[PDB]
């Protein structure tokens, strides 16, 4: 109250940083912050913008669940007070970042009728659709399987428009790789959830009839108390594991985000792997798993309320599943209930689009212009087939921003492989070298041996590696085609022999 609009920005930054840890630090102080917010338009004019955005961040942080009339009051405050398009964009960004998706859709709608170039219009529309889908998802009811499927289907009906728009927004410049891929895998996750919920609901869809009719129920050959749902449970378990590994691909491909987006992605992978483990250890052989969750759990080390809530949900699911491991037969009497409750819990915490999604920093890349016998077109290159080939893979690492903001490249693990174009598919020549870039530049001599007539594909993969030691799969992954021919002297020798 007593800060004269100069120290207020600093104090609000401090408060947001503090509230990022404990929720009771934000839950009960809702009204007073808005009392501060409402008087902004008149108490200053020189730098209204910065304190406006700061107050928006703090209010969103405090607001855990949703926004009341305070919402429309914020909207008007922006409308009457000087409110730059850039400013409203930043408030919308912070809203989306903290999860209060309800405000995001409204603000981005106002934005849409702005901007000049189509790229930004498409990007804004995509973000609006994403936020609206998240808002629709938030309206979930605890323990009611009927509404869950409809809500999920609707939110997916919106993510698809979102993906279309976002894919359109891309350009040769700043092709939104992480943004697009992360959201696409998010739709994949939700589709997996929809399929799983449908399967468990169909459990009652005359499943027992199949197994008993096919074979005697006692000592069931298809499975222990076999049922048609066993095949679908195998299918979805496999799909969930595959999705989990696809997050692995995204994570080991980013390499650029801060230590926040990475933790978020790891968290999503943890959720996926959790559903997989639950379905596998509860529906499939439970005695085979027979693994106890005997590890340190629940230590308050999380860096965000979002992470804390997810860790709480995980612990709830584990403490339920451990108890319910052996109680019933695999017939899945109440196991469906546990699965459904886990799904509802997982969807309850809405989302948080993390920084790397918005605004990219520490731009690093590998040029990797190999210099074999150069091939202007894709015309394959020749080698007598009896001697050898040498590549001379040349690579230079280029930093746009502060070279080492978070992770500094330590080594480049060039991996070269060949395959037979016309057909272990001829991976005899598959090798790797860990060249350290001394200044910015690294060359590597690679030798490829091969004695087959057909063409060959040569693939080189970069796989940068940082100080701590991680794969961090990146790199252009360039290819070169190489022809193979033999001297007629040897041709006649082989013919005669």
């Amino acid at each position: 109250h007593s800060a004269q609009d100069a120290a207020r920005i600093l104090m609000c930054h401090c408060l947001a940083a503090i509230a990022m840890q404990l929720p009771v630090l934000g839950d009960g102080m809702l009204g007073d912050l808005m009392e501060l917010y409402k008087v902004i338009g008149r108490s200053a004019t020189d730098k209204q913008q910065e304190l406006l955005v700061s107050l928006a961040t703090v209010i969103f942080v405090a607001s855990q669940k949703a926004l009341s009339v305070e919402s429309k009051a914020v909207i008007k405050q922006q409308l009457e007070s000087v409110s730059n398009g850039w400013t409203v964009y930043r408030i919308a960004r912070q809203a989306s970042r903290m999860g209060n998706h309800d405000m995001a859709k409204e603000l981005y709608q106002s934005l849409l009728t702005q901007v000049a170039s189509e790229h930004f219009y498409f990007w804004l529309n995509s973000l609006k659709e994403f936020s609206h889908a998240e808002q629709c998802l938030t309206g979930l009811q605890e323990e009611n399987y009927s509404s869950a499927l409809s809500c999920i289907a609707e939110s997916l009906k919106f993510y698809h428009k979102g993906i279309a728009s976002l894919t359109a927004a891309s350009t040769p410049l700043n092709p939104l790789s992480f943004q697009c891929e992360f959201v696409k895998l998010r739709i994949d996750l939700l589709q997996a959830f929809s399929q799983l919920i449908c399967t468990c609901n169909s459990l009652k869809t005359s499943p027992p009839p199949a197994i008993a009719t096919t074979i005697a129920m006692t000592l069931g050959n298809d499975l222990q108390r076999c049922g048609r749902i066993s095949n679908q449970m195998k299918q979805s378990m496999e799909e969930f594991r595959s999705l989990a590994s696809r997050y692995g691909d995204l994570y080991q491909a980013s390499f650029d985000a801060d230590s926040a987006t990475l933790r978020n992605v790891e968290l999503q992978q943890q959720s996926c792997l959790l559903i997989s483990h639950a379905i596998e250890a509860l529906i499939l052989d439970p005695e085979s798993a027979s693994f106890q969750e005997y590890g340190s759990t629940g230590t308050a080390h999380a860096d965000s309320e979002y992470e804390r809530r997810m860790m709480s949900v995980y612990n709830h699911v584990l403490e339920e599943v451990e108890s319910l491991n052996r109680k019933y037969t695999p017939v899945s009497y109440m196991h469906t209930a546990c699965l459904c409750n886990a799904i509802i819990a997982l969807l309850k915490v809405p989302l948080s689009f993390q920084r790397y999604f918005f605004q990219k920093l520490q731009s690093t890349s590998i040029k990797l212009a190999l210099s074999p016998s150069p091939r202007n077109p894709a015309e394959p290159i020749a080698v007598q087939n009896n001697q050898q080939l040498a590549l001379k893979v040349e690579g230079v690492v280029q930093h746009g921003s502060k070279p080492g903001l978070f992770r500094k490249i330590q080594s480049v693990c060039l991996n070269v492989s060949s395959t037979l174009q016309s057909k272990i598919d001829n991976m005899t020549n598959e090798m790797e070298q860990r060249v350290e870039p001394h200044n910015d530049y690294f060359s590597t001599q690679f030798l490829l041996n091969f004695a087959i007539l057909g063409t060959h594909n040569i693939t080189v993969e970069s796989s940068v590696k940082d100080a701590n030691g991680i794969v961090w799969k990146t790199g252009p992954r360039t290819t070169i085609f190489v022809k193979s021919l033999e001297d007629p002297y040897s041709q006649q020798i082989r013919l005669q022999q």
Partner: protein
């Protein structure tokens, strides 16, 4: 025929017993097998809520005579039938009455044996077809009268023989029967969860780039019926088809249905969003595959409006009509997107447009927008599109309209810049294009248009050669490019960073030829404002620019006209830069270089200056010593 209602399907999926009551009689008749199996078979889950649901199912069960028939069907033992089917299948690997009449007269187990044999024969035929689509005829499946019970028994077989009758295999084999779409719809409706799995199986087993084969038509129609059965999950099929790169016709058809379902005129059409994404999406395989689809569609000369391609083209044209009216304000961005989309369709896909399409495109491109940033961008795309596709303009009418539009622009090029406030990217672009034309850099023109449009498309040089006459002969002459050059805004924060071809290059080129003095235009007013603005590092052009500028200030353009001489900067103007520190470091170093070089050149080339008797202002010692 009657398909399963989408409401019925969603009710079955949600096992909403109350909604089952709301369902009308024919829907229940279609859905009987699953319902009766549910009511009679031993309950897998034994919850009291499920028991009450079962009571409700029983409440609904009455009113159907076929219930008894289905009970009889279930009565038949299945182990013996399964082993018999396995033996018959192994043999296959190694009746006076028609099939319909046999199905009728014979009892339930005989019906099972007949239908099972027929389906397995169809399955074997499909397995051996090696991907070749065919047709198989069976009066049983072609009998409208016996359709209902045929489907009923088929559902029971599928439910009871999972291993023998995989659902996806049954679906793909069933594709080949006359009413396979209807059987498939009913079968999937019977078992909800398998809906997405069947969708995946069909799309995977479909062809890549054929929408004219009978198999392609049947498959796409079956999937369309499935989507109509489950609208909520339709777009999942769209994403699946985009990923797998099969059946682009189906891919676009789903979008057409969805855009019909949703009515939001405020934003751009989801059709536009989707097609723009596919063509301009960063991916490459999808881009090439979709281009192949467009190529085949256009090469199909026959004009059939049922074609998805033609439906899509009609939809795009109609969407453009609403936009086309000057031009309204909020429509600028939306018009830009459609402009780029058609640019892609002609260029990166070779979509030959019809005459009315060309007329509408010409109208939009010549439309006057407001002088906002969006208007600047839209006019830029319009002019670039006209640059690229000369075939859009063929008749003298469009020629004259285009010339009129360009003439209207040239008076507003820098006026547009000032009104919008932003640097006129097109304002410098027009200067660049004019210079490139006059000096015959058509390759550079192509390079510029590709960059500005954001898509690398191929252009025939003769197309631009035709317009060269339109461009260099009447609309843009030497004294018109001279008029533009001085009024073009100066490049901000110039450095070596800003790469490309900046207006400094063009100014330097013009000064090389000495057009400014020939057509009596002051240039110091521009050079000085640029030098006040440069920053660090230094752009590699400034020094040659200054050299040529001072060489012009001294030497005349032509001997016959000694009066040709640019005015040197004023000493009072020079003072301001060195007064100090409002300016940069490289700001005043360039000016110091210029003044020193000028004092030197006065003495160096004093012979021609003495010949002219136009001795210029040698700067005062007051400035020369105040300079640090």
């Amino acid at each position: 025929l009657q398909f399963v209602s989408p409401f019925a399907f969603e009710a079955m999926q949600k096992v909403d017993v109350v909604c089952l009551a709301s369902l009308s009689d024919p829907e229940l008749r279609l859905l009987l097998p699953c319902l009766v199996r549910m009511a009679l078979c031993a309950p897998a889950d034994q919850s009291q809520s499920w028991a009450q649901d079962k009571k409700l199912i029983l409440r609904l069960l009455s009113g159907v005579e076929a219930v008894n028939s289905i009970v009889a069907l279930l009565s038949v033992d299945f182990h013996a039938l399964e082993q018999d089917a396995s033996k018959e299948q192994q043999l296959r690997h190694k009746l006076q009455h028609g099939l319909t009449l046999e199905f009728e007269h014979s009892d339930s187990p005989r019906r099972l044996r007949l239908v099972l044999s027929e389906l397995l024969a169809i399955m074997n035929k499909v397995s051996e077809s090696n991907g070749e689509f065919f047709f198989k005829s069976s009066e049983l499946f072609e009998s409208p009268v016996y359709l209902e019970e045929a489907a009923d028994v088929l559902c029971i077989l599928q439910a009871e023989l999972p291993s023998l009758l995989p659902i996806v295999d049954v679906a793909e084999a069933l594709l080949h029967v006359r009413n396979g779409a209807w059987f498939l719809c009913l079968l999937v409706a019977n078992v909800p969860d398998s809906f997405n799995e069947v969708c995946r199986g069909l799309i995977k087993n479909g062809e890549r780039q054929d929408e004219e084969s009978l198999g392609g038509r049947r498959r796409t129609d079956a999937l369309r019926f499935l989507c109509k059965m489950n609208p909520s999950q339709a777009l999942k099929v769209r994403g699946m088809v985009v990923e797998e790169c099969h059946l682009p016709g189906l891919g676009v058809a789903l979008t057409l249905d969805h855009t019909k379902n949703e009515a939001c005129e405020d934003g751009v059409s989801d059709l536009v969003c989707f097609v723009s994404g596919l063509l301009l999406g960063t991916n490459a395989k999808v881009r090439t595959w979709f281009g192949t689809f467009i190529r085949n569609g256009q090469q199909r000369k026959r004009e059939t409006s049922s074609s998805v391609l033609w439906q899509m083209r009609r939809q795009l044209l109609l969407e453009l009509m609403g936009i086309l009216p000057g031009l309204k304000e909020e429509h600028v961005v939306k018009a830009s997107a459609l402009l780029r989309l058609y640019c892609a369709l002609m260029g990166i896909a070779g979509l030959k447009p019809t005459e009315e399409e060309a007329e509408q495109l010409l109208q939009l491109m010549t439309s006057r927008p407001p002088a906002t940033p969006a208007g600047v961008r839209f006019v830029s795309l319009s002019f670039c599109m006209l640059l690229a596709f000369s075939t859009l303009v063929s008749t003298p009418e469009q020629e004259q309209l285009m010339v009129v539009w360009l003439s209207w622009m040239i008076k507003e090029e820098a006026y547009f810049e000032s009104t919008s406030g932003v640097s006129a990217s097109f304002g410098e672009m027009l200067l660049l294009v004019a210079m490139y034309f006059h000096s015959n850099q058509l390759s550079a023109i192509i390079d510029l248009v590709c960059s500005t449009l954001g898509m690398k498309i191929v252009i025939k040089p003769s197309s631009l050669s035709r317009m060269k006459t339109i461009f260099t002969q009447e609309i843009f002459t030497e004294q018109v490019v001279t008029a533009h050059a001085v009024r073009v805004p100066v490049t901000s924060n110039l450095s070596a960073n800003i790469t490309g071809f900046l207006p400094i290059h063009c100014i330097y080129q013009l000064l090389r030829s000495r057009s400014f003095t020939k057509h009596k235009v002051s240039i110091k007013d521009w050079i000085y404002r640029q030098l006040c603005e440069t920053s660090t590092p230094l752009h590699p052009q400034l020094l040659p620019l200054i050299d040529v500028y001072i060489n012009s200030i001294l030497t005349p353009a032509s001997k016959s006209n000694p009066e040709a001489t640019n005015q040197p900067v004023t000493e009072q103007e020079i003072l301001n830069i060195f007064q100090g520190q409002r300016f940069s470091i490289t700001a005043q170093l360039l000016v110091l270089y210029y003044i020193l070089s000028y004092e030197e050149a006065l003495l160096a080339n004093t012979k021609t200056l003495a010949a002219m008797q136009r001795k210029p202002k040698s700067y005062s010692s007051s400035l020369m010593d105040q300079i640090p």
